[PDB]
Amino acid sequence: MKLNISYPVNGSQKTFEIDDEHRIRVFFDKRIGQEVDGEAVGDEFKGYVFKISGGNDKQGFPMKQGVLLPTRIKLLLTKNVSCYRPRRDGERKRKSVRGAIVGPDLAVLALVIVKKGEQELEGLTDTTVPKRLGPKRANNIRKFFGLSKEDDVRDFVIRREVTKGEKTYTK
Amino acid sequence: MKVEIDSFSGAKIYPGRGTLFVRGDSKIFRFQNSKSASLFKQRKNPRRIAWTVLFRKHHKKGITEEVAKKRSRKTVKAQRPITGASLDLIKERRSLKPEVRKAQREEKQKADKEKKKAAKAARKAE
RNA sequence: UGAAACUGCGAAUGGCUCAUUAAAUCAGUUAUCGUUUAUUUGAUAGUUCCUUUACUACAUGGUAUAACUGUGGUAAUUCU
RNA sequence: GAUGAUUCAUAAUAACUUUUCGAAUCGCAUGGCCUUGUGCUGGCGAUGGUUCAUUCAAAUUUCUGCCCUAUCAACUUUCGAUGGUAGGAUAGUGGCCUACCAUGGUUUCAACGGGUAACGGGGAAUAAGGGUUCGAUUCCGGAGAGGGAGCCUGAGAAACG
RNA sequence: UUAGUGACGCGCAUGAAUGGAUUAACGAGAUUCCCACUGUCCCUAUCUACUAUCUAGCGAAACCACAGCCAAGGGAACGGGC
RNA sequence: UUGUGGCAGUCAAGCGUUCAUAGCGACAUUGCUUUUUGAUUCUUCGAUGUCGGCUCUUCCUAUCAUACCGAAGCAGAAUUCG
RNA sequence: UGAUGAAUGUUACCGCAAUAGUAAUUGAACUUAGUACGAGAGGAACAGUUCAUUCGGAUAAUUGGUUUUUGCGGCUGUCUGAUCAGGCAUUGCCGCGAAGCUACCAUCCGCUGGAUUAUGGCUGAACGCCUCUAAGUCAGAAUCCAUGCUAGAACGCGGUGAUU
RNA sequence: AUGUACAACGGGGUAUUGUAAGCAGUAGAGUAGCCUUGUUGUUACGAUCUGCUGAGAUUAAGCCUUUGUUGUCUGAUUUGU
């Protein structure tokens, strides 16, 4: 199948195409949120332990947490719940979704690294990505730097420099 | 070959063993024995039948396979380079917490400038 | 200045048709001392520190989350 | 104090409440007092909030009135029909619903039932006068979104772009 | 559908107390059809009891010219005998 | 016994666009059969259980089909005679 | 129809095979082929493959039926003082129900070789030619006879063992 | 006719049915009674429910198996080339 994996410490993420039914039978008969060792599926992932966060079956239907039932169903979905974006206030809709349990019916798994092995990955571990923004709240900054109730957040601001042309500015 | 699960009792159904009933909702049921089939046709409920997998489940019998999920207690432990931060300079700014006297001197210079600006505004009004 | 997205409002107005419906609608005429009412308009909270003598930030408290970055699923949907 | 009239308005005591509301909001102006501190005060607005009233309404509702049919004369009441008591529900009255009880209610002044090629009115046509026929349709009020039932959101829908 | 039912009617040979026609109800009457039901059937299988069976005891009858393998022949034209 | 019934032949006037005989076959005629009905009265009237159906076996062939073949007015297909 | 059995020196085992009987059956579909043939319309066949019909012989792994397994449980009435456990209800009733029996209601299987008929032919006379025929001869049918299948002559037999 | 002998029992396996009795329970429609008046108050009744309990019973009479226990294993008749 395919594995969309994420190393959240770096903040990076990468896809991996996979074969070997008898390596992915480890993932078979599992739920979302459980943990799984990595060398069981690939020696490249030796010492790695992964958590599952989601998946998308063939025909496009996602999964949902602790629903049950490795097959598909239809469910009524509303606000403050995944898999449904309401286009009208109070709206609800009966959508098809796939269960939480893992099986061969998936084209994709969504994996996240909770602990690193010993060999490092070129796409996740070596590289790192930035936090594309910084705080905007005063106390958020004050605890970001752990300063005080007095330490001039206006001095501890972060500014981004853009180069529209020859002229640049720190925003 | 596949192996199957009695729709009533929950039992592995090996080939050439049991039956298969197709109901006019196009729904398929599988039986390992005329016992469970007769009960299905008598339209009983396995949750009330005491020897079926579903009953043992609903009554939590020998079901210690699953135990519990634990709770996570671990900080982020990654000062991410926010990309307007210059993570080295970000650690420098995080370590430069003391020396608020510079902020105080800047505030005093700003106070002097604000007084001068108020005076200039009053003079221009005059 | 200003796309996108969050938020607030609106989307129940209007427009179309006359199928139902014969004390039902409806007309004119009463009543709410029997009731709800966004919006408007005009008025309108000194009293909330909880053993309320250190229990507290009151120059002012905290957490997410979109948009966005990037990885993808799907044949396809104002899907995710 | 008011009303034609109240257990009205309003106020007061005792407690209750999973505890509501009583501004951690925004723009423009930036001014006065000084024991000159980022000291204390300070304007014109936008937004938001409890309650009352008002306005926009809404829901129920009194009285009088509707075409043709007796080759429809008895209808309603089992399982709500008329009423009473109490309670639930309602935003609120009320058989609106439930429990208990009584046996009532409508009718030749046409009930009930059936039919309508019937949405009702304001009004249109034609007329000496009286009248007859029509009115889906430019305004008002209703109902409906292919047929039925249901429901979230909201002040407001049994919503249908 | 040679059945049944309704109709037609120059009716071998209908017909009026030799009673005619009709008829609610009734009927161990006769008849047809439909619904349900079924081992009547497709198409048969299995179980039970008492029998049959074997044994102990008891113990008959009908019938009997003599008796008891067939084919054909001829023969009173279909014999166990020739 | 075989009129009657059934079955098969001989001949060949004609039908068959022509052409007696592919397939048919008039007038006439030779036969077979006992699954028709008759005729007869031999056997049985001191009793041979009477129609049909159900069931079951076997036989005959004058073969409906199936196997092989021949002929055609048999191009194929289908059909017909043997 | 099936089943015993005297006497053959005894007893036992393995066998032979005279005679008798005999069984397999029919069709469709794909392909051959929209080919051959035919103007066209239409429309084959042999071989091959997968299946099936009628019949037969078995079998009971599976499914189904049967239930005195009176096996487990349940139910009504009555009786044992109640309980527990049971009796009776001409198998009390109900559901499940193994084992056994069993079903084209289930599953499996159902042989090939020769000699021929009709008919078509070879050579070839009779008849100097011609002819399947007269002599000889070839191939040939769901035919017959064997192979195979079932009994095993109880007056049909063999080999072999131990024989007081 | 003294042994991988045979049987009767027992045990185990396999099957069938469907969770035994008994005990306990702050389970239980509700209803009476109590007084220490209750601040679950407790006692009694009460279909049934839950746990011990896929438990218990039956299981070869034509099922499998046995390192167990207890037994049994010389009666009669006839036969000759």
Side-chain angles (χ1 to χ4, degrees), chain A, chain B residues 1-62 68 78 81 84-85 98 103 111 118-119 121-122 125:
Chain A
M1 62 180 67
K2 193 187 284 177
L3 315 182
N4 194 320
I5 310 175
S6 61
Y7 186 48
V9 193
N10 281 331
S12 177
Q13 61 214 0
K14 163 172 266 286
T15 47
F16 298 85
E17 184 194 349
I18 301 294
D19 273 28
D20 205 309
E21 73 301 342
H22 68 265
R23 285 282 198 73
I24 46 164
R25 63 177 58 268
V26 180
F27 298 137
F28 287 10
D29 301 61
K30 307 288 284 181
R31 302 197 189 121
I32 297 158
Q34 314 198 250
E35 296 295 17
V36 59
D37 186 289
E39 55 250 42
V41 66
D43 55 5
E44 51 265 8
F45 327 114
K46 193 167 203 314
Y48 288 81
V49 69
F50 303 84
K51 193 189 83 191
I52 307 153
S53 62
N56 308 63
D57 74 340
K58 301 160 272 274
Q59 312 105 31
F61 306 93
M63 311 210 283
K64 191 164 203 83
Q65 218 287 318
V67 162
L68 269 195
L69 190 83
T71 81
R72 270 210 303 268
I73 62 169
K74 278 177 171 281
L75 290 177
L76 207 69
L77 308 173
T78 175
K79 54 156 166 294
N80 296 131
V81 168
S82 316
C83 317
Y84 174 48
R85 177 164 76 72
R87 329 302 178 85
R88 190 145 179 165
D89 199 342
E91 196 178 25
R92 310 178 300 191
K93 207 189 276 178
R94 188 178 297 280
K95 302 194 73 51
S96 295
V97 72
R98 187 251 178 272
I101 297 163
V102 178
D105 58 16
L106 294 145
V108 174
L109 291 169
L111 313 178
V112 54
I113 300 138
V114 58
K115 187 263 282 173
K116 183 169 63 168
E118 58 277 13
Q119 65 266 54
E120 61 187 338
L121 272 295
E122 55 266 32
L124 306 186
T125 304
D126 291 330
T127 177
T128 186
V129 295
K131 283 172 83 182
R132 197 156 165 71
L133 308 166
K136 210 181 186 101
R137 184 181 291 182
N139 280 322
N140 279 19
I141 297 157
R142 273 176 168 166
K143 72 192 284 286
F144 184 83
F145 293 137
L147 310 177
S148 74
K149 189 141 46 176
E150 51 78 24
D151 268 319
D152 189 350
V153 286
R154 283 190 296 193
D155 180 277
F156 285 78
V157 183
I158 294 92
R159 334 186 52 102
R160 187 165 67 94
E161 198 196 356
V162 308
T163 72
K164 208 177 184 71
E166 80 303 341
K167 189 174 171 184
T168 82
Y169 42 102
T170 67
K171 43 173 66 168
Chain B
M1 83 189 188
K2 205 193 160 82
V3 189
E4 289 86 1
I5 312 298
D6 189 302
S7 289
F8 191 93
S9 64
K12 285 180 279 225
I13 283 153
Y14 280 107
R17 189 62 68 78
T19 62
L20 187 142
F21 172 46
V22 181
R23 208 175 53 181
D25 58 355
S26 314
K27 182 164 176 62
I28 291 157
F29 296 83
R30 284 146 189 294
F31 308 129
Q32 191 261 301
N33 49 48
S34 53
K35 179 201 208 174
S36 83
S38 195
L39 293 170
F40 186 91
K41 179 165 77 170
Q42 292 152 240
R43 49 188 191 278
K44 308 262 168 181
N45 188 345
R47 276 180 191 285
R48 306 198 97 178
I49 302 296
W51 48 266
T52 58
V53 166
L54 204 54
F55 176 101
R56 309 205 100 228
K57 171 64 166 294
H58 177 225
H59 292 40
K60 310 292 174 57
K61 291 183 162 296

